[PDB]
Amino acid sequence: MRVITLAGSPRFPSRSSSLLEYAREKLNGLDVEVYHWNLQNFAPEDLLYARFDSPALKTFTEQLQQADGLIVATPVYKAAYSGALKTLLDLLPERALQGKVVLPLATGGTVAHLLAVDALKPVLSALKAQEILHGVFADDSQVIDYHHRPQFTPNLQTRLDTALETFWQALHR
Amino acid sequence: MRVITLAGSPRFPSRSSSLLEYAREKLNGLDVEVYHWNLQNFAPEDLLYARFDSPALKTFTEQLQQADGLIVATPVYKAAYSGALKTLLDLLPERALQGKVVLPLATGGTVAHLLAVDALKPVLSALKAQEILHGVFADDSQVIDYHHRPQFTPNLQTRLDTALETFWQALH
């Protein structure tokens, strides 16, 4: 099995990239091949101006088509997912997530941000995801020194491990 | 009175920009000052990588600060507003629409697209807009020309004029 990870932060490193490095490690340990992407793998002018001839878009799309699941992480901005992430999602084929399991992750610093934990759901449903797991919310305080190795407070670590085990099981269903 | 218009399409010209050009013609006639922006006015690197020193961002935010209202138009992609528009909205200050009236416009080709006519509402609410008008949907099939001067079907023209009159009344 094959999983795409996608960080949707405007910056790298980010809290999103820390969550997804952990996810990649856990999935690799389960013998899952991981295709690891972030927004800095794309040219901004191709994302902002919807250039379907983008080589990174075509490469990502080829790899996504082969993947059984997607783990996607975004900071919460203005009560929703990041526009930066959405620029890439908007350029995917219309049924790009058909037959795939999706685990959404969100990061932010306030209760208002926590209310946006499932803001990607309509977008992922529009992309025809087969199964959309409950979104995991990582408060900014729970991701420790995201510039270096993945490091989480125990509350977040437990929730992330739980979600990743649910995701792994869903890949088999 | 001052109004900002903001086209949220990845391409220019677009159906969105044509709606806003129509609005600009009307507001010109009503002696409302209009500052018109599109996403091609920004450096894409600044929007995608959230670079707040962006000069165009500074000018846009200063013009928005002095504006009484905002007309914002987006194509509908994946059941929501465009990500390209949202990249710019994400860089605005926390209460950037405080005290302002907003008219949201959306374009698309199917009824699924129509269902996202109010998709911007949570974002505009997060920006503390004083009054968010009901969203107006323009079907692609009723935009006859968006490259030259805007040309719309009579029904779309009537509906846009009605919404723009509502917007003008709200400003006053």
From Swiss-Prot, chain B:
Induction entry: Repressed by sulfate or cysteine.
Cross-referenced Gene3D superfamilies: 3.40.50.360
EC supergroup of this enzyme: oxidoreductase
Gene Ontology molecular function, alphabetical: FMN reductase (NADPH) activity; FMN reductase [NAD(P)H] activity; protein homodimerization activity
EC number(s) per entry: 1.5.1.38
Recorded GO CC terms: FMN reductase complex
Catalytic reaction list: FMNH2 + NADP(+) = FMN + NADPH + 2 H(+)
Any one GO BP annotation for this protein: alkanesulfonate catabolic process
Pfam family, one: FMN_red
Function (record text): Catalyzes an NADPH-dependent reduction of FMN, but is also able to reduce FAD or riboflavin.
Subunit structure: Homodimer.
Protein's name according to its UniProt entry: FMN reductase (NADPH)
Protein's organism: Escherichia coli (strain K12)
Gene label: ssuE
